């Protein structure tokens, strides 16, 4: 389980650092302020400054994530959606689900014109876990990374 | 507490230009967004667009995007609508509004300038 | 192009009815709507936010429902203080768009 959640991590990390071109030194336009929730949260800032190009690496790191889920592991899938975002889906069709949710959005004026330069984080449950929060940089890139956050938590509700 | 001050009545001439003024009072001028809406004599409302003080950053109707400019002065807590080629369809009520950190919802309004372009 | 159909554009009605002005969009706007009221000749006023949330000094006759393409804001209790014109706007997605606008009026 968290086992999986590393996975993500890294590859966002990965995913973002490769087609995004951040690093961890490089400057933040959006800053995290707080993270509200046995769960261990961090914020790890892998800020750069071409929103688009974040929230394309978020997702094909999501999708790698995923399509390397195992059967039993994918199965469960479906649940967390219902739970986390209040949207139904199937093990053949998560994916694009996920990606419309996110284009829907992460493009929302009050994502993509919110001209707020400290960002806040809440999330309401979690289950000893360690959870990593990427600050992107963009609203729309951690846009995102809170629409994973929030499947990976009510995932560590089993 | 929150005020939008507004230039008063003008008279403009067709095919010439305008500019007006909306001075923001009560609140932080510069991490709100202002938005300005016409309404023409005995019609609705009309979303022209709006700015964001601080960046500068700016939003537009398409039908607008050649009639009007939006600017804002900081050290002034201004914000400013220029209109260009005064048609008599620009002959209408303006009003400016305070928006949130994102423009969303218009909840304090400014008093409205009536342009009547004439000759 | 989020496009907004409001209905009805007129309305009459006795003290004390209920009223009900109807917000249809294009597209899902998910909540992200406020209703307006303009007295003759002032400004508009907001009335509620959000889609349901009533705004600061506004009385309680006044509600705000709705989803995702249909909104509504109803009058319990129509009130001859409530004349005017009411307008719908969303902000999902700039640019933003209004309504065409409820002309309200009183049968007496």
């Known amino acids: 389980i968290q086992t999986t959640v590393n996975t993500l991590s890294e590859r966002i990390s990965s995913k973002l650092e490769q087609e995004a071109n951040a690093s961890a030194q490089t400057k933040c336009d959006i800053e995290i302020g707080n993270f509200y929730i046995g769960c261990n949260i961090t914020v790890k800032n892998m800020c750069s400054a071409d929103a688009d190009a974040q929230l394309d690496a978020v997702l094909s790191a999501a999708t790698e994530t995923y399509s390397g889920l195992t059967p039993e592991q994918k199965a469960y899938v479906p649940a967390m959606f219902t739970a986390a975002l209040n949207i139904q889906t199937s093990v053949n069709t998560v994916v694009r689900d996920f990606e419309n949710y996110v284009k829907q959005t992460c493009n929302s004026s009050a994502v993509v014109d919110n001209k707020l330069k400290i960002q806040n984080v809440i999330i309401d449950e979690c289950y000893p876990t360690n959870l990593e929060f990427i600050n992107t940089g963009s609203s729309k890139g951690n846009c995102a990374i809170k629409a994973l956050m929030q499947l990976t938590t009510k995932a560590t509700t089993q | 507490q929150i005020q939008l001050q507004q230039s008063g009545a003008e008279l403009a001439r067709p095919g010439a230009s305008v500019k007006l003024s909306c001075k923001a009072s009560?609140?932080?001028?510069?991490?709100?967004?202002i938005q300005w809406v016409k309404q023409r004599p005995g019609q609705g409302l009309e979303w022209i667009g709006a700015?964001?003080?601080?960046?500068?950053?700016?939003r537009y109707t398409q039908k607008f995007k050649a009639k009007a400019t939006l600017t804002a002065d900081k050290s002034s807590s201004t914000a400013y609508m220029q209109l260009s080629t005064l048609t008599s369809e620009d002959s209408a009520v303006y009003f400016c509004a305070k928006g949130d950190t994102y423009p969303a919802a218009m909840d304090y309004w400014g008093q409205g300038t009536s342009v009547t372009v004439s000759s | 192009d989020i496009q907004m159909t409001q209905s009805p554009a007129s309305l009459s009605a006795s003290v004390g009815e209920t009223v009900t002005i109807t917000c249809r969009t294009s597209?899902?706007?998910?909540?992200?709507l406020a209703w307006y009221q303009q007295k003759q000749g002032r400004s508009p006023q907001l009335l509620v936010n959000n889609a349901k949330t009533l705004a600061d000094g506004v009385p309680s006759r006044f509600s705000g429902s709705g989803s995702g393409t249909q909104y509504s804001l109803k009058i319990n209790s129509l009130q001859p203080e409530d004349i005017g014109s009411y307008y719908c706007?969303?902000?999902?997605?700039?640019?933003?768009?209004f309504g065409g606008g409820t002309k309200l009026e009183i049968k007496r």
């Open positions: 700015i964001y003080p601080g960046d500068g950053d700016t």
């Open positions: 706007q969303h902000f999902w997605i700039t640019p933003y768009t």
């Open positions: 009560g609140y932080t001028f510069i991490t709100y967004w």
């Open positions: 597209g899902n706007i998910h909540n992200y």
